[PDB]
Design an enzyme around this catalytic site. Structure first.
Site, PDB file in Angstrom:
ATOM      1  N   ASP A 412       9.902   6.276  -3.407  1.00  0.00           N
ATOM      2  CA  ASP A 412       9.807   6.247  -1.761  1.00  0.00           C
ATOM      3  C   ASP A 412      10.623   6.726  -0.565  1.00  0.00           C
ATOM      4  OD1 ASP A 412       7.251   4.492  -0.084  1.00  0.00           O
ATOM      5  OD2 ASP A 412       8.915   3.570   0.041  1.00  0.00           O
ATOM      6  N   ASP A 705       9.997   0.732  -4.432  1.00  0.00           N
ATOM      7  CA  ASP A 705       9.603  -0.155  -3.997  1.00  0.00           C
ATOM      8  C   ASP A 705       8.827  -1.565  -2.931  1.00  0.00           C
ATOM      9  OD1 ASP A 705       9.555   0.282  -1.395  1.00  0.00           O
ATOM     10  OD2 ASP A 705      11.414  -0.688  -0.207  1.00  0.00           O
ATOM     11  N   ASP A 709       2.756   1.486  -3.342  1.00  0.00           N
ATOM     12  CA  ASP A 709       3.277   2.349  -4.107  1.00  0.00           C
ATOM     13  C   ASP A 709       3.413   1.519  -6.010  1.00  0.00           C
ATOM     14  OD1 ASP A 709       5.814   1.206  -3.682  1.00  0.00           O
ATOM     15  OD2 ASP A 709       7.138   2.851  -3.356  1.00  0.00           O
TER      16      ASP A 709
HETATM   17  F1  BEF Z   1       7.783   5.919   2.446  1.00  0.00           F
HETATM   18 BE1  BEF Z   1       7.479   5.702   1.391  1.00  0.00          BE
HETATM   19  F2  BEF Z   1       5.952   4.515   1.691  1.00  0.00           F
HETATM   20  F3  BEF Z   1       8.134   3.319   2.079  1.00  0.00           F
HETATM   21 MG   LIG Z   2       9.001   1.331   0.646  1.00  0.00          MG
END
Ligand code: BEF
Ligand SMILES: [Mg+2]
Ligand SMILES: CCCCCCCC(=O)OC[C@H](COP(=O)(O)O[C@@H]1[C@H](O)[C@H](OP(=O)(O)O)[C@H](O)[C@H](OP(=O)(O)O)[C@H]1O)OC(=O)CCCCCCC
Ligand SMILES: CC(C)CCC[C@@H](C)[C@H]1CC[C@H]2[C@@H]3CC=C4C[C@@H](OC(=O)CCC(=O)O)CC[C@]4(C)[C@H]3CC[C@]12C
Ligand SMILES: CC(C)CCC[C@@H](C)[C@H]1CC[C@H]2[C@@H]3CC=C4C[C@@H](OC(=O)CCC(=O)O)CC[C@]4(C)[C@H]3CC[C@]12C
Ligand SMILES: CC(C)CCC[C@@H](C)[C@H]1CC[C@H]2[C@@H]3CC=C4C[C@@H](OC(=O)CCC(=O)O)CC[C@]4(C)[C@H]3CC[C@]12C
Ligand SMILES: CCCCCCCCCCCCO[C@@H]1O[C@H](CO)[C@@H](O[C@H]2O[C@H](CO)[C@@H](O)[C@H](O)[C@H]2O)[C@H](O)[C@H]1O
Ligand SMILES: CC(C)CCC[C@@H](C)[C@H]1CC[C@H]2[C@@H]3CC=C4C[C@@H](O)CC[C@]4(C)[C@H]3CC[C@]12C
Ligand SMILES: CC(C)CCC[C@@H](C)[C@H]1CC[C@H]2[C@@H]3CC=C4C[C@@H](O)CC[C@]4(C)[C@H]3CC[C@]12C
Ligand SMILES: CC(C)CCC[C@@H](C)[C@H]1CC[C@H]2[C@@H]3CC=C4C[C@@H](O)CC[C@]4(C)[C@H]3CC[C@]12C
Ligand SMILES: CC(C)CCC[C@@H](C)[C@H]1CC[C@H]2[C@@H]3CC=C4C[C@@H](O)CC[C@]4(C)[C@H]3CC[C@]12C
Ligand SMILES: *[C@@H]1O[C@H](CO)[C@@H](O)[C@H](O)[C@H]1NC(C)=O
Ligand SMILES: CCCCCCCCCCCCCC
Ligand SMILES: [NH3+]CCC[NH2+]CCCC[NH2+]CCC[NH3+]
Ligand SMILES: CCCCCCCCCCCC
Ligand SMILES: CCCCCCCCCC
Ligand SMILES: CCCCCCCCCC
Ligand SMILES: CCCCCCCCCC
Ligand SMILES: CCCCCCCCCC
Ligand SMILES: CCCCCCCCCC
Ligand SMILES: CCCCCCCCCC
Ligand SMILES: CCCCCCCCCC
Ligand SMILES: CCCCCCCCCC
Length: 1000
Positions: A412, A705, A709
């Protein structure tokens, strides 16, 4: 996809199922339909239990309720209801498909109480109930493993063969493991249930007025919520019908920026929420605020509820999702051969039937170790403690083995690779019609208007807080700022108009009144005088917006009346900084051929800039953005490839991923093979990408995190959470410290668990097989080891070596080469086979050598196996085998490159030395432990020295065999059948693209 409905017989089935005593395996085997066919007693309209194949089999109960008759059933969290008009079941989520926006607006008023009752009976409660199961339910569900049944059978046999102690030990191990497993599974389910629970007091209007207040559980699609003026989480999915709102959709996109949601455009044409995403409020997303501007309050009509919501879909996917270590044919055939040989020789050496049965059955337990899974899990327990000593906490230790064979990691962007927020990159003053150079920190600047505006203009909103922190003017007329100069107090201010993104403040100091305006670049620049505003406002701004940054314009004037005549003072640029430890980790992974991918809900521009910055895309590597236009229905969707500034890398968007999945299935593997950036990904799209990559024969982990996700973390082979709440529930691993450094160490740890396990496996196999061979030798002459000998081989030696060979840790570095993955590999089988050829040679040679002595007398075979002891053959074979076990344990274990060198674990070597010392004492020192262990005290010294020399020969031969095998088997494998062409799907696609690069 087809299904059927099965309308006294249970009593017969219960007796038949219990009477067979093995039909549960057959029912649990490939053919379970017969077990359901007899019990269910096999129309769709009239049924009480349904079975469906997903072309796979699944059984569900046809629940019912009274409203005027309803028949419904749940499946994968989705409800289906029976309809008499077509006499068939229909998914409730599609009951009202393609509602017109005017039809939605017609529900401006709420839902009548009677209609509320019937519609709740149809759709059901708004909660997302996790079906937590009782302890017996967990036992019968997730602890039906056939190995536990085999362990129980072996235990029962051992109590029937007077081998109480080891049976008790195995029983304790299995029972404790089962209890801990059930406990932690129940705790995980309970915690998930807590996480998804939601409770609020929500207002709902009615056509009879007097807008009532109800619980979140009562909402059904068709009534409208009166959104609170302050904010709060959204109980369900809904569509704004009156007013505007600012929402914080960090749960879906991963970003905390406020997002404007306006009313639904009234008219005909269906409402889908794929195109009306800007006019729909999703479940879980926090409402920052709600401003009506029309009527008495903000109104939003419900559209989805329960599992139908986006959060509902994510949790549904979460609930509903070595391997070759369980080879069956070789062990089964070998056990069969050994058994039939045992019965043949035993009936050749007349002994009672019950003894024959007991011995033959016990030979099976000798063949298959019942202590194998515990030996496997000891090293994973070691690794779990090691990780927990350095932050990362694991819930399933056996999952750590997957970390060893990991080869792809998804990351992420926000919060994981970059800070969870924006930060000032610098301010850009401009005097005339030309920007001055970007300033790193605005603190060091004159006391001109620009610094005053940098210090004063704010709503005091993390963004303004960061502004005030950077400028450093400490707070102490609506305020008085102290420069760390002159004291500037805020004389007047205006609210930040949501429509026109301006925020104005008028200030004055002891030294004329002056107004400062903070706003979007283009609009504020339009407010300003083009004389001072430069010619290149469009390019100086696209340079930053295209680079993922967010710019804000500062305008001013010395005092609608305020934001009129203005001149630009500068531009303040904000950026999501990379965390200080992401580039070293990313490059460390890249130099070991672990592919790193970015999977973000952010826009594509920020994603690509961060990817270049963190090292996922080297400065010399190409990068191409593939865009897929939606199908106009006159022409199909078609891909277009856009290069950028310049191993190939592809940067895919969010909607384009779904478009390629739906309309280009054939090209999706090629894109996934060489795709590195996935932006604007929905929470379900991350899980979809993970699933597709796994279908490409990858071992994918992810280090998300945020809340968005979470399904991807569950689907990933090795999921890691950097947040200690809202994501640790599903993740197998969780790190207190929040950065990418947790990823590599885990991988290193995984390799140990994947490497030590292999050695452990080999030892156990050898331990069993050599024991089997020895038993056969003694069974050939109507003799057996002995209960105390059996315990001294099974209890002390195996436990000691197995636990002490698992202490070793990793080698502090990540090599480019993975450890072996398949336990049935050529090297493993060759090593085992050669070691056993050696061991069998030594044991048979010792037996045939001890017969050629002047002082040897055979045992009398008229007596039973245990009453033949003390005995020459028994003591000789036990003496050889006991050393052989330690020899195998020492030779099997390895050191570098996945573990520390084998000489570091002083406890293991000392244990081997002490065990060998006591064994040589048993062989040499006469009559000290030969009372318990029925040994016959060989008197001839020369023969004892010969036995010691022979076992020393076995020791050196085994070590040299392992060394030469490890250092000369790869050459033989490569020189034979050089056309390797690795069978993994992604490697095949990589080669195909290497020959013919798909993007021309
Ligand atoms: F780009 Be991640 F979904 F914070
Ligand atoms: Mg994130
Ligand atoms: C009776 C049962 C025996 C089982 C035998 C084991 C199966 C067998 O043969 O491995 C194929 C081997 C090599 O197989 P082997 O090397 O053991 O393992 C394979 C490769 O190593 C492959 O390597 P990469 O290119 O890096 O993928 C990959 O890693 C897979 O292993 P993984 O679990 O680590 O992913 C396997 O596809 O291919 C030959 O080297 C020709 C000589 C073969 C002689 C065949 C005689 C039988
Ligand atoms: C490898 C072989 C020897 C299998 C051994 C399995 C045991 C570990 C099982 C058999 C019976 C089980 C017990 C059966 C019943 C209960 C009652 C249960 O208490 C309840 O009655 C409430 C349960 C609930 O409401 O969920 C707590 C677990 C316990 C002790 C179980 C714990 C695990 C036990 C001892
Ligand atoms: C009597 C029969 C049934 C044999 C039972 C063997 C047990 C006594 C073994 C099996 C698992 C072992 C444990 C496996 C793992 C660890 C982790 C290990 O942790 C570390 O030392 C690394 C962490 C760090 O130091 O940073 C400490 C020993 C301990 C608790 C071991 C202690 C001994 C245990 C309980
Ligand atoms: C009737 C006779 C055969 C008595 C047998 C007694 C057994 C129950 C003893 C003998 C040796 C003992 C083992 C000797 C050494 C260890 C190492 C010990 O290692 C650790 O505690 C962890 C070391 C680390 O983490 O560094 C764990 C228990 C264990 C397996 C002991 C468990 C109990 C054993 C098997
Ligand atoms: C020959 C030497 C013998 C050594 C004896 C000493 C070691 C005994 C260790 C027994 C294992 C106890 O450890 C416990 O095992 C069970 C399965 O085995 C693991 O269970 C694992 O699988 C279950 C599903 O089947 C998962 O729900 C659970 O998340 C996962 O970890 C437990 O997570 C682990 O904590
Ligand atoms: C050759 C003859 C004498 C051996 C007969 C012993 C049979 C009955 C033994 C050998 C291995 C045993 C099985 C191993 C695996 C399973 C699956 C498990 O989920 C239920 C118990 C069950 C079914 C065990 C009990 C009975 C079993 C089949
Ligand atoms: C009576 C006949 C079968 C002889 C006895 C041999 C028995 C003990 C053999 C035959 C097939 C074997 C099983 C085959 C499959 C598996 C799957 C694995 O994940 C756990 C072990 C387990 C369950 C094996 C245990 C031992 C086993 C049950
Ligand atoms: C005395 C004879 C019968 C042997 C019995 C040994 C007992 C003490 C063994 C059997 C299973 C063992 C447990 C198995 C696994 C774990 C989990 C690990 O994370 C910490 C240690 C712990 C909790 C072990 C402690 C010791 C233990 C309870
Ligand atoms: C007690 C008497 C019989 C001595 C027996 C000691 C044996 C079992 C042990 C103790 C120390 C061990 C050695 C320690 C160091 C190394 C170097 C490293 O490459 C691993 C193998 C090797 C070469 C080991 C081989 C086995 C070894 C020699
Ligand atoms: C073996 O059997 C008998 C008793 O079963 C034992 O006393 C003796 O040592 C042996 N028999 C002979 C004849 O030596
Ligand atoms: C290296 C393993 C040695 C095993 C020692 C066995 C000791 C048994 C204790 C005595 C029990 C029987 C006495 C009646
Ligand atoms: N590794 C499992 C094999 C266990 N074999 C134990 C055999 C015990 C023999 N008991 C014979 C009893 C004689 N009264
Ligand atoms: C718990 C490990 C077993 C230790 C107690 C048993 C000792 C062996 C007794 C043998 C009697 C013949
Ligand atoms: C599928 C796991 C069980 C396989 C057992 C094989 C048959 C054992 C002999 C009946
Ligand atoms: C004696 C059986 C209990 C051993 C302890 C079980 C796990 C403890 C986790 C702290
Ligand atoms: C019946 C013995 C139970 C031991 C495990 C209880 C849980 C310990 C805390 C995880
Ligand atoms: C039997 C008591 C000894 C067990 C080993 C103690 C730990 C030493 C390695 C740290
Ligand atoms: C009996 C096997 C354990 C011996 C351990 C000796 C201590 C090693 C740590 C210095
Ligand atoms: C013939 C007397 C015995 C010879 C023994 C040679 C092997 C010694 C190494 C332990
Ligand atoms: C690890 C196997 C050890 C064998 C020892 C050989 C005897 C040496 C002392 C004479
Ligand atoms: C690199 C270390 C190689 C160790 C091989 C084993 C040597 C055994 C000497 C008997």
């Amino acid at each position: 996809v087809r299904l059927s409905g099965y309308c006294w017989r249970v009593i017969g089935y219960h007796v038949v199922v219990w009477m067979m005593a093995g039909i549960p395996l057959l029912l649990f085997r490939w053919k379970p339909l017969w077990g359901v066919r007899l019990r269910l007693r096999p129309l769709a309209h009239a049924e009480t239990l349904v079975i469906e194949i997903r072309d796979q089999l699944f059984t569900v109960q046809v629940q019912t309720e009274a409203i005027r008759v309803l028949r419904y059933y749940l499946f994968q969290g989705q409800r289906y209801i029976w309809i008499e008009t077509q006499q068939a079941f229909y998914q409730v989520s599609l009951l009202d498909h393609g509602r017109s926006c005017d039809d939605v607006h017609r529900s401006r008023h709420g839902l009548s109480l009677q209609d509320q009752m019937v519609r709740k009976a149809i759709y059901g409660p708004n909660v997302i109930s996790i079906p937590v199961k009782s302890y017996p339910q967990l036992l019968v569900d997730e602890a039906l493993n056939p190995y536990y049944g085999f362990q129980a059978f072996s235990i029962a046999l051992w109590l029937a063969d007077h081998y109480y102690w080891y049976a008790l030990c195995i029983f304790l191990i299995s029972s404790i493991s089962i209890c801990l497993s059930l406990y932690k599974t129940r705790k995980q389910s309970q915690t998930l249930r807590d996480m998804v629970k939601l409770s609020m007091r929500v207002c709902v209007c009615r056509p009879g007025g007097e807008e009532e207040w109800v619980d979140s559980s009562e909402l059904v699609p068709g009534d409208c919520l009166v959104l609170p003026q302050e904010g709060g989480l959204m109980p369900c999915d809904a569509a704004l019908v009156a007013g505007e709102c600012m929402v914080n959709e960090s749960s879906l996109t991963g970003e905390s920026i406020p997002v404007l949601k306006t009313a639904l455009p009234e008219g005909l044409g269906p409402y889908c929420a794929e195109t009306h995403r800007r006019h729909t409020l999703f479940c879980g997303t926090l409402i920052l605020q709600a401003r009506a501007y029309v009527g008495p309050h903000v109104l939003a009509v419900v559209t989805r509820t329960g599992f139908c919501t986006a959060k509902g879909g994510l949790v549904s996917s979460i609930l509903h999702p070595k391997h070759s270590m369980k080879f069956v044919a070789a062990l089964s055939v070998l056990a069969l051969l050994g058994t039939i040989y045992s019965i043949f020789i035993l009936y050749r050496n007349r002994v009672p039937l019950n003894e024959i049965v007991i011995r033959a059955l016990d030979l099976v337990t000798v063949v298959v170790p019942p202590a194998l899974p515990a030996a496997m899990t000891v090293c994973t327990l070691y690794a779990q403690s090691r990780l927990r000593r350095q932050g990362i906490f694991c819930i399933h230790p056996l999952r750590i083995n997957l970390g060893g064979k990991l080869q792809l990691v998804c990351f992420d962007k926000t919060g994981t690779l970059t800070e969870d927020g924006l930060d000032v990159m610098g301010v850009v003053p401009l005097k005339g019609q030309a920007f001055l150079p970007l300033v790193p920190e605005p603190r060091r600047l004159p006391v001109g208007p620009l610094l005053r505006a940098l210090a004063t203009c704010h709503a005091l909103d993390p963004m303004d807080l960061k502004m005030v922190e950077s400028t450093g003017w400490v707070l102490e007329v609506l305020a008085v700022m102290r420069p760390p100069p002159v004291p500037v107090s805020v004389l007047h201010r205006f609210p930040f108009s949501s429509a026109l993104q301006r925020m104005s403040v008028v200030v004055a100091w002891p030294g004329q009144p002056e107004a400062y305006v903070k706003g979007s670049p283009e609009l504020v620049a339009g407010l300003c005088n083009p004389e001072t505003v430069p010619t290149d406002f469009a390019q100086m701004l696209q340079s930053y917006t295209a680079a993922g940054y967010r710019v804000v314009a500062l305008a001013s004037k010395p005092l609608d009346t305020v934001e009129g005549d203005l001149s630009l003072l500068g531009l303040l640029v904000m950026r999501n900084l990379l965390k200080p430890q992401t580039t070293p980790v990313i490059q460390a992974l890249r130099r070991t051929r672990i592919r790193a991918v970015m999977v973000t809900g952010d826009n594509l521009q920020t994603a690509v800039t961060v990817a270049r910055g963190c090292g996922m895309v080297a400065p010399q590597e190409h990068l191409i953005i593939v865009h897929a236009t939606h199908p106009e229905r006159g022409q199909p969707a078609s891909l277009e490839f856009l290069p950028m500034e310049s191993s190939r890398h592809l940067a895919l968007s969010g909607p384009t991923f779904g478009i390629i999945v739906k309309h280009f299935p054939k090209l999706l593997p090629k894109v996934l093979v060489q795709g590195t950036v996935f932006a604007r990904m929905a929470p379900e799209q991350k899980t979809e990408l993970v699933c597709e990559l796994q279908k490409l024969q990858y071992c994918v982990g992810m280090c998300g995190d945020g809340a968005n996700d979470c399904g991807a973390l569950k689907a990933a082979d090795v999921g890691i959470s950097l947040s200690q709440a809202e994501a640790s529930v599903v993740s197998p691993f969780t790190s207190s410290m929040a950065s990418i450094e947790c990823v590599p160490m885990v991988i290193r740890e995984g390799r140990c668990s994947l490497d030590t396990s292999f050695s452990v496996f080999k030892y156990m196999a050898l331990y069993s097989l050599t024991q089997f061979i020895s038993v056969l030798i003694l069974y050939t002459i109507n003799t057996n080891l002995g209960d105390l000998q059996f315990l001294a081989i099974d209890l002390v030696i195996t436990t000691t070596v197995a636990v002490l060979m698992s202490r070793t840790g990793p080698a502090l570095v990540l090599g480019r080469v993975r450890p072996p993955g398949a336990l049935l590999s050529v090297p493993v089988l060759s090593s085992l086979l050669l070691q056993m050829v050696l061991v069998t040679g030594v044991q048979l040679g010792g037996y045939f050598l001890t017969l050629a002595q002047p002082w040897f007398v055979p045992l009398n075979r008229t007596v039973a196996a245990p009453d033949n002891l003390p005995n020459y053959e028994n003591t000789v074979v036990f003496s050889l085998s006991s050393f052989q076990y330690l020899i195998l344990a020492a030779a099997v274990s390895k050191g570098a490159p996945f573990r520390r060198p084998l000489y570091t674990n002083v406890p293991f070597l000392v244990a081997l030395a002490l065990l060998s010392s006591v064994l040589v004492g048993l062989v040499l020192v006469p009559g000290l432990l030969q009372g318990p262990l029925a040994l016959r005290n060989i008197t001839d010294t020369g023969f004892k020295l010969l036995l010691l020399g022979l076992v020393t020969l076995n020791f050196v031969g085994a070590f040299m065999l392992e060394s030469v095998l490890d250092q000369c088997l790869p050459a033989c494998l490569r020189r034979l059948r050089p056309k390797r062409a690795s069978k993994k799907r992604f490697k095949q696609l990589e080669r195909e693209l290497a020959e013919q690069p798909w993007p021309p």
